[PDB]
Design a protein around this ligand. Sequence first.
Ligand SMILES: Cc1ncc(C[n+]2c([C@@](C)(O)C(=O)O)sc(CCOP(=O)(O)OP(=O)(O)O)c2C)c(N)n1
Ligand SMILES: Cc1ncc(C[n+]2c([C@@](C)(O)C(=O)O)sc(CCOP(=O)(O)OP(=O)(O)O)c2C)c(N)n1
Ligand SMILES: Cc1ncc(C[n+]2c([C@@](C)(O)C(=O)O)sc(CCOP(=O)(O)OP(=O)(O)O)c2C)c(N)n1
Ligand SMILES: [Mg+2]
Ligand SMILES: [Mg+2]
Ligand SMILES: [Mg+2]
Lengths: 560, 565, 555
Amino acid sequence: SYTVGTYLAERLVQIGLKHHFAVAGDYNLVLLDNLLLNKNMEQVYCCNELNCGFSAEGYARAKGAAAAVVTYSVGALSAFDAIGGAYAENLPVILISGAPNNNDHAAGHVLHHALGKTDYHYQLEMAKNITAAAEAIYTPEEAPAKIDHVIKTALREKKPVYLEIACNIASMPCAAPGPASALFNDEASDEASLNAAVEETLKFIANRDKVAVLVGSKLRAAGAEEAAVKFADALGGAVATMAAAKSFFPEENPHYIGTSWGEVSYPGVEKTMKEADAVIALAPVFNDYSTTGWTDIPDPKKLVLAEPRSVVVNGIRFPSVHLKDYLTRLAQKVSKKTGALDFFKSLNAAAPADPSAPLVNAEIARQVEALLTPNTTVIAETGDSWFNAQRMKLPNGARVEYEMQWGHIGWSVPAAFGYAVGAPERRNILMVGDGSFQLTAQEVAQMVRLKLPVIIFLINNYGYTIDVMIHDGPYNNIKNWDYAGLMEVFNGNGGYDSGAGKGLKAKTGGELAEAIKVALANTDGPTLIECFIGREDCTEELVKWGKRVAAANSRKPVNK
Amino acid sequence: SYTVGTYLAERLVQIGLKHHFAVAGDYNLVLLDNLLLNKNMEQVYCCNELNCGFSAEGYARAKGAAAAVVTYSVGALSAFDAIGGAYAENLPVILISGAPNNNDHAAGHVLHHALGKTDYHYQLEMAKNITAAAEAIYTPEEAPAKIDHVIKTALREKKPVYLEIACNIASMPCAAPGPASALFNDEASDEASLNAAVEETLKFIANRDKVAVLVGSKLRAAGAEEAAVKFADALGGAVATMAAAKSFFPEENPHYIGTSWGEVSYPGVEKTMKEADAVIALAPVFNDYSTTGWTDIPDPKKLVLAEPRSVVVNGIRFPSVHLKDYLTRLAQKVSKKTGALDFFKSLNAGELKKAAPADPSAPLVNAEIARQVEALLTPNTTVIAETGDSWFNAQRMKLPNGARVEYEMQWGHIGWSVPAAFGYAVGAPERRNILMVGDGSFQLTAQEVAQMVRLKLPVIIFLINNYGYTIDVMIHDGPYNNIKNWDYAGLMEVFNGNGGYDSGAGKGLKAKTGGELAEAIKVALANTDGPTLIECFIGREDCTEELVKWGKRVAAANSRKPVNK
Amino acid sequence: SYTVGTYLAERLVQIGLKHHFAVAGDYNLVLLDNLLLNKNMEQVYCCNELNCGFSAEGYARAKGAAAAVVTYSVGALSAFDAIGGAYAENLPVILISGAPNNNDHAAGHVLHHALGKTDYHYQLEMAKNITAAAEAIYTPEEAPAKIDHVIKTALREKKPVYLEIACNIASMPCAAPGPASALFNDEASDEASLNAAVEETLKFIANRDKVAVLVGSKLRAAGAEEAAVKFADALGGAVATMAAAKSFFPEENPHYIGTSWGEVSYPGVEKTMKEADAVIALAPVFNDYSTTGWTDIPDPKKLVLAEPRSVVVNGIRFPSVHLKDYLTRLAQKVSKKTGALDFFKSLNDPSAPLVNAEIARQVEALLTPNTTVIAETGDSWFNAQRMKLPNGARVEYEMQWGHIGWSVPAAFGYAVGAPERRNILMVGDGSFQLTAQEVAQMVRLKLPVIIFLINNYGYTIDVMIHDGPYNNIKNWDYAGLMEVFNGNGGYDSGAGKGLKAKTGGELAEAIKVALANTDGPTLIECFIGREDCTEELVKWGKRVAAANSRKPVNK
Ligand SMILES: Cc1ncc(C[n+]2c([C@@](C)(O)C(=O)O)sc(CCOP(=O)(O)OP(=O)(O)O)c2C)c(N)n1
Ligand SMILES: Cc1ncc(C[n+]2c([C@@](C)(O)C(=O)O)sc(CCOP(=O)(O)OP(=O)(O)O)c2C)c(N)n1
Ligand SMILES: Cc1ncc(C[n+]2c([C@@](C)(O)C(=O)O)sc(CCOP(=O)(O)OP(=O)(O)O)c2C)c(N)n1
Ligand SMILES: [Mg+2]
Ligand SMILES: [Mg+2]
Ligand SMILES: [Mg+2]
C-alpha cells in the first residue's frame, strides 16, 4: 500500500505539484527514494538549500503551490530564509526536512548536523515562527494526519508550512490518502456577511462619485484577479495597482491608470488618489516600502478595505467573506462611478540615444519592454530592476513577479529557475543586478541542466546601486565577475554532461539588440546578457524613493 | 564620545578582531559606517549571508573569535545556519543583525524584509535556539550592557552569540567601553575540586597499567592543547586522536599512535583502545559519526571524562575545573603508566598503508592526490578539509608538528569549507592555506572564492571532481547523488573579470594525471597574488576504503527500525 | 553510589538548603522518595503549586536559595507564576518537575497531564522564558552535568532555574557529586576594572561635595549590604533607600535619611535627592512603580550607577566588577562628602472604631532586631514603608513581581527558613484570598507567624488607582478560618488562633494573644474602612493610573 514517503508524494501530486525540489542528505535519502516511487511527479535537485527554497517559491508562483525537501539542520536552517520569504509573499510552499532516527530522542545521543546537544526539537520550534503550520513526524501512524493538516493549512492560508520526518520511518507502512477534494475543502462565504458587506459598500459610494480601485499584492493569493476585472468594468472607475501588485490587473483595461506608489507613482495617479472620494483597496499590503517611507498612507475615512477573507467598510468589519465572492457580488449590483477616471483623464500629468553609444539604463528597459508578450513572465529582482520593470507597459496576459515584501536579493535567480520548471512554455525573462546575482548565481547551472530557456538580463553597474541611493558607503562595492563567462563554466562543455547556456556582453544599444536576438533563438538553455551601465545611471524613481526610505529608516526615537 | 556602533566596534577590536565580515542592507548601513570609524579593524564584505557566517567561522579558527554583520531577516535567517555551525564547532562568532527602527514596535507597522505581520521579535526568538546569548538592542542606553554580556558570554562558553540593533540608534551616543581585560574575566578553577579531581584520577589509574589518552575535538576550545602535551609526556601512555581532533595533538610525539575511529582507525589503534584499562578522554564529542555508526563506544567503567570545565573520574563529577588546569596539575603529579603504548607497539601493526608515487602519465587516482597534498603539509600549513571523502583523505595524512587540519565534523554543512577557507586565510596570512573540497560541496558556496581573488589571498584549492556526491553514494546511492558538472578550473577567470571593471589574479588548472597534478601544484605555489584552483579528475568509486566501511555503518544506524516503547 | 534523585538532594544540601518544598504527583513520586533519603533536609508539603513555588521564594529570602518540586504540566505551569516571581525578585529558586517516562518521547504516545499531543517539550520551552537556565533530564548519565549546571547558574546570577526529570530515571545510578565549593565558584572582579571604576568615582565626586547614596533592591542579591554600610560611614553623605530596598540599610545609621520614592518619599528626602551634586545608586531597579509613574527619574548627569556586576560612572561602563568589592575599596579611599546630609539636616481612640493609622502604630511598636515583616501588595506596602526599623529588623517586599497573595506562602516559606525570628505578615483581605490555604501549613508545622489581615472589604489599592465593581470582594470570617485549618476534633491537630479587632484595644489584645501563641500562627482580622488608607497610596495611585493610561505617541 502506502508509506510515509509515498503518502506525502501522493498528497503533493493531488494538490497540483508536478515537481518537488530537493537537496540530498543522509537524513532524507530514504524519503527521497519513496518520493521517487510516484509516477506523477519529478524530483528536481538544487545546488544549496537557500536556492532549493527560493526555487520552490518561484514554482509556487507558477503552479500555485510547491515542495522542498532538505536534510536536518544544515539543510533546513538556510532554507528557513526562503520559507520566511514564502510566508511574506503568501505562497504555499511545503518544506520537508529529513530528521533523526526516532530512537535518538531522550536517549543521551549527540547526532551529526546538530548543535552538539542531546535534544532535537530546536529546528521544529524555529520553524513555528515562519510558517502557518509546523509538524514533526516521529512515527508512521501519525504521518497521515500531520501531512494532511499542514497541506490543508497551506492551501487555505496561502502560507508555507513545515514537516520533519524521522529518517527511519520514511519507508514504514501507513494509511492511504483519501480524495484530493478534501485538501481544498474550505468554508464558503457567510451569506449574511457577504450581503451586508456589499450593501454597505453601495451605501458608502452612493454619494461619492470619484471612486478609485487600488489593486493589492495579495490579489492573486485570494484568487480574485478575474473577479477584480468584472467589478472594475462594472464600476467604470479608475484602477491603480500598488507596486507589488503589477500584472495582477490587465493593463490594457480602459480603466487602468497605472502605478500608485506615492511621489514615484505613474504620472497623475498620485493626484487621482488624493482627489478620490472613495478608495476600494483589493487585498493591499501597506508597508514602509509600498508607502514610500510612510509618505503615502491611504485616508482611512475614504478607504474600503477588501482583504482576501474579510471586508472593512462603512466602519464595520465583515470577516468570513471571500474577496472573490465580494467582488463578484458587487460587480453585479454596482452602479457606474466614473468620476475618478474622468478626473485622471483631465489631468495633464529616459531621453534615448543611439545604439552606437555607451549603453544606458533607459535603453535596457526599452528593449526589454519590447520583448513583452501575453505569454511572457518577467522576474524582477530587488534593486533598480524593481523600478525599471514597474515602468513597463504589460500586454494582457503578461506577468511580473515581485518579491517586494521579503526583498531577499538573490531571490530572483532560483525563483526564475523554479518558475521556469513550472511554466517552461512561457517567455521567461529574469531582470537581475550583479549585486543580487552573486548570492545565488549557481542555480543558473540548474537552468542549464534542465535545458530551460531563461533570458537573463544581468545589470552590471558594478555594485549595489539601490543601496548607493539609500545610503552610500564602501559596503556598496563588490568584486566584479565576467558574468557572460560564467555560462560556459556552467555548461562544463569539456567534462562530463553538457549545457547550452549562452553568455553575451552588451556595452551599447546595438550590441544589446543583437544579444537579445540570440537569446530568443536560444531555447535550449538560458542566455545571460551582461549589460554594462554606470552606477549613477538609474531610474529617477529609485533616487526619490531611496531618499524617503533612508529618512524613514533613520528617524529618531520618539520619546516614550 | 562613543556611539552604539563604535562601542561595539571598540569591543570587537578589544577581543582581538582585526576584521569583521559583512553584507550590507538598509537596516545596517549606519551601523557599518560606525564600525568603519574604528581603523584598528578592517570591514570585509561577502557575497551572501551564509558565506559571511562561515567566513567568520573560519576566521574564529584562525584567531579565536569573529563577527559577522547582516541585515534584518533576509540576512540573518540564512546566517543562522552558519551560526548554528559555530555553536556545534565551539567557535565564538558574534552575529550582529541590523533591525527595524525602534518606533515601529507596537505600532501596527508592517515592514520590509519581514513576514508581513506587525511584530519583530521572531528573529530574536529563533536565534536563542542556536546561541549562548542573544540580545536585541532597542535604545542607546541599553547597548553597553547587552554588547558586553553577549561578548563575555561568547568568550567564556566558546559559543556564538546574537545581537540585533535598531537601525536608528547605531549612531546614537552611549557610555564608553571600559578595560578590555573585563571581557576575558572568567572564574578560576575551584582549588579543592582541581586537587580532588587529580587525586581521584591518580587513585583510578593506580592499578590500571594500560592507560590510553583519547584527544577530543573540544580540546582547542578549552585551550588545553599545550597542557595535553605536558600530561601525555609525563604519563607515557598511548595517545590517540578522535577523527574530529586531528592536529589537536603533535603527531611527531612518540606517544601518538594515530586515529581512533572504530573499524576505520589507524592500524593497531582499535585493538589498543579496547585493551586499555583506563581511557582519559580529553574534551571529547561522542556522536553517531565519531563512533562509526555507534559501533565504537568507550567503556563507561574505564572512562575518565575530562571535559573543558568539568572532570568525571572514579565515579565522581567535579564541575568548576578548567581542563587546562587539570592537565597541568595531573602532569606534575602523575606517574609513568606506559602499559597501553607498550601494547600498541607490540601489536607490530605497522603504520598506515600508503601508496607509492604513481606513473605521472597514468590516469589520476584518489591515492595520488592524497599523496601530493600530504607532501605540502608543513609546520606552517593548514588544510581545510570539507565534508566528503576529503574527511578521510585528510585523516590519513601524516602531520608534521605545527601542521593544522580544520574539520567541521559536528555541523557537517557541505560548502562550509569555501567561505571558511576565505575567513581563515584572512586571519592567517602567514600560513600555507590549503583547501581540499569536493565538486558537490564546492557548488553550495563557490562564489566566496571571488573574495579570495579580491583580497589577493594565495589559497591553494584542490577541487576533487568525481562527478557527484561520492560520500553519499557510499552511504545510500540514488539519482539525488548526481550533480550538474562545472568547468571548475574555468570558474577562476570568471571571478578575475580581467578586462572588466576591476581585476584578479586567481588561476584555474586541470589535473588528470599525477604529472599534471605535480605541475599544477608548482604553478599554485608560484601564484602569490591570488588563489589557485586545481581541478582533480577521478572516478566516483575511486574513494578511500575508510569511507566505504564508514558509510556502511552510518547507513545502518540511520535506518535502524523503531524500538518498542 | 548516588542516584539521579539523591544527586540532586545532595547538591541542594550542599548549597545550604535545609528544606525543599513539594506537591506530589505520579510523575514525581519516585523522585520525592530519593530526595527523602537525605536526612540533612526535610521535605515540606504544600496545598498547591503556586503556593509551593511562592513558599520556595520566601525561603530563598531567608536562606539565600531554595527548591520546589512539582508534577508535570498540571503542577509546573501554575508554579511558573512563582518562578517568574523569583526571577523578578532576583532569588535563586530551583524548580524541579516530574516528567514523562523517557520511553514516551517520539513514540506517538498521548500522556495524562498533557495537552493531548504526542510531544513533551512545551513545558521546557515555556520555562526558558522565565529562568536563567532550563534543563530536561531524560537519561541518568546526563543528570549530574545538568543539575550542576542549573544550580551553578542560579547561585551566580541570583535567578531561578528549571529542571525536569523523566519519572523512570529518578532512582537510577549516576556519578557522585564533588565538593560543594565548586557550586559557589564565581569569577573575581577584574582588577584593572575595579581599580578604574573606583578612581573615576573619586574623580567624579572630588569636586561634588553633596553626595547622596541611593540604596536599591538588588543590594542583597549582590551581597553588598555590609559593604554599603562601610562606604556610607566612610563617606558621611546622605543615605536613602528606594521603596523596594527597605531594610537593606540600617535605619539607625546616622547617615540614613529615609525612603526615596518621589512625591511619596520621606519628609526632606525628595528635596535632598534633587539638591545632591552626585547620586551613587547601589543596585537600583527603576520601573514605573519605583519611579512613581515615571514622575521621579534620576538625573543621569549626576548619577553613578553601581549595579551588582558593573559600574557606570562619568560616562564609562565597567563590567566584571562586583558591587561588594567596589564599595569596599571605595570606602577605603573616599573622603568626607557631607554636604548632602548637612542640607537634609536643616531642611527638617482605644475604644473608637479602628483606623489604619492605629494598626500601623501598634505593628511598628512590635518591631525588634529579630523581626521580619512580610509586606503584601496593597496599602500594606505603604504602611510597612512608613515604619522605622530597629537595626537588624527585616522587611520583605515583592515590589517587582507584585503578585497579590504572594505574602502568605512567602511568609510560610520564610518562617520555615527562619523559625527563630519574629515573623510578621501584613496582608489585605483581597490578597489573602488567593493563597490563604497555605496558612494551614503554618498551623501544621507550628509556625508562630503573626498575621495582620487588613479587612477593608475589597481591593483598596485598586480603588485608588481606578475604581469599579471589580474591586469588590466576598467577605469571609477570616478570624474563623484559623479553627477550620486547625481541624481540632477531627483527624489531626492545630494550634492556630484567629481573632477579631474592631478597636485599638481589641487590636492590642489580639497582639498580646499573638505574642503568647508560640505553637501556631495568629490571624488578627482588622476592620477598617475602604477609604481609610495612607495618603501616599492616593498620591502614588494617581501617578500610576496616569502612567498606565498614557495615550499612544506617534509613529
Ligand atoms: C539577503 C539580502 N542581503 C542584503 C540585502 C540588502 N540589499 C538591498 C535591500 C533593498 O534589501 C536593502 O538595502 O534594504 S538592495 C541590495 C543591493 C542590490 O544590488 P543589485 O546590483 O542587485 O541592484 P542594483 O545595483 O540596484 O541594480 C542589498 C544588498 C537584501 N535585500 N537581501
Ligand atoms: C548543507 C548540506 N546539505 C546536504 C548535506 C548532505 N551531504 C553530506 C552529508 C555529510 O551530510 C551526508 O549525507 O553524510 S555529504 C554531501 C555531498 C558531498 O559531496 P562532495 O562532492 O563534496 O564529496 P565527495 O564526492 O565525497 O568528494 C551532502 C549533500 C550536508 N552535509 N550539508
Ligand atoms: C495575581 C494578581 N492579580 C491581580 C493583581 C492586581 N492587583 C493589584 C496591583 C497593584 O498589582 C495592580 O492593580 O496592578 S493590588 C490588588 C488588590 C490588593 O488588595 P488588598 O485588599 O490585599 O490590599 P488593600 O485593599 O490595599 O489592603 C490587585 C488584585 C495582582 N497584583 N496580582
Ligand atoms: Mg548592481
Ligand atoms: Mg564529489
Ligand atoms: Mg483590602
